[PDB]
Symmetry: C2
């Protein structure tokens, strides 16, 4: 009697939290006794790359950015125009043995910008600018590869280290500047915070610190303020909501200090429309690892907010004469859709409302649509936005999970569409895309083990091998996130039995630990 189900949907909330979120993008217990350390390999490497870039080359990036990446870089930098000047002086002082701090800070800010560019640059327009030729060698990878492969992704990664290595030249610890928060924000537009979850969390904490160090609570240019300062405050506010955004996104056990929590939910300007929407995403996902349920009255309150923000989003036109307006419209629409999907998934899980699953299937498709429509406009670099990756993960997983329990040919098809789409997302998503693919493959194998094996009522609860395996995938990731052993090493250095056979079998064939990166 599939009467258990309700307690099983409620369970997904934690599986989502632990596996699809924490475990796949924010986990990384490394053995320090085995990790090489030094301030030498990063100095030479981030010195070579800086050489690989030519004056004109870098300037086309500036143009790719100005003519494309507006919706990302604005929030934290505003009209690049002002920055070209800096990209210019960058080279001027590029020829000096004598270098300052305001100098480097300006350097790093533009090198984080370059990072973002390489990241989004359509592989084709990138090749017409650089050539893997003088790159395969240095690195040491046969010319067996090219731009089409991660070799482009071996720049959104290294350029990123050139931004960090350069900040490490300002000794930013000792000289807080908004430019550190600005550089980080730009690096945030990429997969950097997922590649280096531990570092990114420390750099964000530094950014929270640097931000509060200005002690500005009210960003509105108040009466009789010098226009220069009225502007800096306004700017600071844009930077602020951008900062709350990646803060909420990087939430987890390895990120204990918060900033976004100092900002109230709506349940209590285009730029700020961004946080408005993320505010609602926070309002919902906050229940994933929670024990309590979102009162139904709440979901409706958020539903109503969505409505207004949905409307408000379409109300902001889009002229295809600028990729800027097109990419902004995409992020807008993707964001609301995502929150919407999350919204009805919630209804379906906590209250099993009417039209819930129908709605989930709807926004699930709206999502696949938005991504799928970007190949059809040769603005596919739009899909490289870290938001896509995140959304597809939660959507596919839940659908893939719902599929193994609640049969439906509608969902079975949707799952096919998503399964396809998954292994189609741009490749700049590296290691993770594969990890998600593996994760999908896995939850499907867990379907078979549910159709094969027989569930049985003990009278108090139901028992199945796919039930433990699910429970385990959480305990195993939840343990990979307990730093207590790490504490023990840095200190005094001291140091239903049939399923039990079925589980361990699967567990050895498909260990969740394979998702960790």
């Amino acid at each position: 009697s599939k009467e258990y189900l309700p307690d099983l949907l409620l369970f997904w909330q934690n599986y989502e939290y632990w596996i699809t979120n924490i475990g796949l993008y924010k986990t990384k217990q490394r053995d320090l006794t085995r990790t090489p350390a030094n301030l030498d390999t990063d100095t030479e490497e981030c010195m070579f790359w800086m050489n690989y870039l030519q004056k004109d080359q870098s300037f086309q990036l500036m143009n790719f950015a100005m003519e494309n990446l507006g919706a990302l870089y604005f929030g934290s930098i505003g009209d690049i125009s002002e920055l070209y000047l800096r990209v210019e002086q960058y080279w001027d002082r590029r020829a000096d043995k004598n270098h300052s701090v305001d100098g480097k800070y300006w350097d790093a800010l533009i090198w984080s910008v370059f990072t973002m560019c390489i990241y989004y640059m359509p592989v084709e327009k990138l090749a017409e600018i650089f050539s893997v030729y003088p790159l395969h060698e240095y690195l040491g990878s046969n010319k067996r590869l090219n731009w089409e492969d991660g070799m482009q992704l071996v720049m959104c990664q290294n350029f990123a280290r050139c931004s960090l290595f350069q900040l490490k030249q300002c000794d930013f610890m000792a000289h807080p500047d908004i430019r550190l928060v600005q550089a980080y924000l730009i690096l945030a537009t990429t997969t950097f915070p997922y590649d280096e979850p531990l570092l990114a969390n420390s750099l964000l904490t530094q950014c929270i610190h640097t931000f509060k160090n200005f002690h500005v609570d009210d960003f509105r240019p108040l009466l009789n303020d010098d226009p220069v300062e009225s502007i800096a405050k306004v700017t600071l506010g844009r930077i602020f909501y951008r900062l709350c955004g990646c803060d909420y996104l990087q939430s987890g056990p390895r990120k204990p200090i918060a900033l976004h929590t100092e900002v109230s939910s709506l349940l209590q300007s285009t730029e700020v429309l961004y946080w408005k929407i993320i505010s609602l995403d926070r309002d919902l996902d906050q229940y994933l690892n929670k024990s309590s349920k979102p009162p139904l009255k709440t979901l409706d309150a958020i539903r109503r907010e969505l409505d207004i923000f949905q409307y408000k989003v379409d109300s902001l036109e889009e002229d295809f004469r600028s990729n800027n307006s097109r990419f902004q419209k995409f992020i807008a629409l993707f964001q609301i859709s995502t929150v919407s999907w999350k919204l009805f998934k919630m209804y379906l899980i906590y209250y099993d409302t009417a039209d819930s699953l129908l709605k989930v299937i709807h926004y699930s498709k709206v999502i696949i649509s938005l991504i799928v429509n970007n190949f059809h406009a040769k603005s596919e670099f739009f899909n490289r936005h870290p938001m896509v990756m995140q959304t597809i993960t939660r959507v596919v997983s839940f659908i893939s999970f719902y599929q193994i329990f609640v049969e439906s040919a509608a969902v079975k098809q949707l799952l096919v569409d998503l399964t396809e789409l998954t292994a189609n997302l741009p490749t700049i998503f590296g290691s993770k895309l594969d990890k998600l693919v593996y994760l999908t493959e896995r939850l499907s194998k867990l379907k078979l083990l549910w159709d094969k094996v027989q569930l049985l009522d003990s009278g108090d609860s139901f028992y199945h091998p796919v039930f433990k395996i699910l429970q385990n995938d959480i305990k195993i990731i939840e343990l990979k996130n307990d730093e207590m052993f790490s504490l023990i090493k840095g200190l005094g250095s001291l140091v239903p039995s049939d399923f039990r056979t079925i589980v361990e079998e699967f567990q050895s064939e498909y260990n969740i630990s394979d998702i960790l990166s």
Copy 2:
């Protein structure tokens, strides 16, 4: 009619806060366009010093520490014995091109220990170990100097950079460890947090982050816990209260993120006796920059707590057979005395209670006593503890300030005793001691200008040139702490008239800005 006075004592609370505290030890607006930056001069320098230290040399430091500095290093490291092993393996791996992270972390922890040692090492016992010979040269300072001078202090400063430079090798941002918090805590025992207020605040924020990253709320080894873990928790708790302590101490505008605030005041074990007492210091000083007054009932509640802690302190014996027990007793007694002084100063200022000034004069003398008694036991290195410096500053200043307004031959003498003592505190206090001396000299010159010039009742308020000069010293320091201009540069880069003659005169002869370091 000296009827104004009450509002003038209340004013001292802010002068103390801004000048004697923030302005003298936690201020540092530097021009980034003028600051040289690089990861080269620290790598070579912190490579030379590391060479200057010999195996046996460093090991005597270990012995100075084990046989002296127990009361400082325990809280965060516990029985050095365990660490000698590390000082040993330090050298073993000292001969490697291949170096890890757990490696460096252990290195830095012992190099922070060395720092502390050099800092406290009696100049005499230091010379019998090292020789300025191979030091004056490298640096570039004529052999015109020697250990007796800051040349010893050019180690508690460089050794400190060797601890930092080495942490910068573990990329601690990416690999949080308690050893970072432990190293910082040891560096805390020195004047490091005052030499580099901006850096120390960022390293502390990193420590708050690293600490919470363990997610341990209850430090008591709870039921059926593996003794190894029960021990690590207990350890972590010692580290925790030690961490709240330097956190409260480093409070200010440049340190926006807090940790100690997560710990309640008592008004709501020897190791924890430390925070107990600092908790009471916090309970009192929290009113310095506040607008409201400490209800009298509060002061009494703290007074009563002091009593118990005073008693509890004397109740912990002291055998002069170990400098350890002697230095612990000193810190104990100094702490309570200090809080006590603060306590009655408060009574005298906010409520003008009876025996207040008498009590202030009492603990003021008890303090001078405790410091003065350390030359008389050739354990003068006891006075090098950053606590002394801090306490003498608040005591001398207030006394020096009370002196210019409220004449008394008792205070006039006390002020003489303090004025002497001031220019007698060990020299490892460098730049600051002089700044305090200058500050004292200054408040005395402000006495003359009060005896000379004539105060006058406008009927609504009283007006005097020493009144503005006082008000100004605050606005001028309070402005040196407004980062809004720093925000403006890192961004879009845009950019009673007789006293009015008297003030500016003084102001040019004795500018408070001279205290900033």
